[PDB]
Amino acid sequence: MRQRILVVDDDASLAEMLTIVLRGEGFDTAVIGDGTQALTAVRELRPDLVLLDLMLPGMNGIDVCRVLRADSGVPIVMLTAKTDTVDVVLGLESGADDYIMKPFKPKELVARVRARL
Ligand SMILES: [Mg+2]
Q1: How far is the CA of 9 from the centre of ligand 1 (A)?
Q2: How far is the CA of 11 from the centre of ligand 1 (A)?
Q3: How far is the CA of 1 from the centre of ligand 1 (A)?
Q4: H or E element, residue 77
Q5: Most buried one in 23, 34, 65, 114, CB count within 10 A?
Q6: Which CATH superfamily is domain 1-117 in?
């Protein structure tokens, strides 16, 4: 079976782009736009890696990271924008393995994803 990446971002357009690009790189993808549905998604989907937007509707990325981190050791990479008010390092401390600045070169994102797997 191919590796699975769960994308948790409220940016539907960006998520579609990640879907296409990641799928093009040989991965399978699933998308959720809300933090509250992340735990269930992870438990059900069983993703190899989670790409997690730091600022989300419902639960925020740091909060989501904690819950996920509590459930398992699945790798989490934060997606963060320079605009974001919350500090991404806080997310790393909550257990995320890495982070990426938005917007990004898809090529760079895939590489980092491959590196944290
Ligand atoms: Mg956002």
Answers
A1: 7
A2: 6
A3: 31
A4: strand 76-81
A5: 65
A6: Response regulator (3.40.50.2300)
Tell me the structure's resolution in angstroms, rounded to a single decimal: 2.5
C-alpha 94/C-alpha 32 separation (Å) is 20
Q: Which residues contact 20 (CB under 8 A, 6 or more apart)?
A: none
The experimental technique behind this entry is X-ray
- Ligand 1 geometric centre to CA of 60 (Å): 9
Tokens 């997310």 belong to residue: 91
What is the distance in A from the centroid of ligand 1 to the CA of 37? 16
C-alpha of residue 112 to centroid of ligand 1, in Å: 20
Q: DSSP 3-state assignment of 84? A: coil
Output the CA angle 112-58-42, nearest 5 degrees. Answer: 50
Could you state, in order of their start, the residue ranges of all structural domains in the chain? 1-117
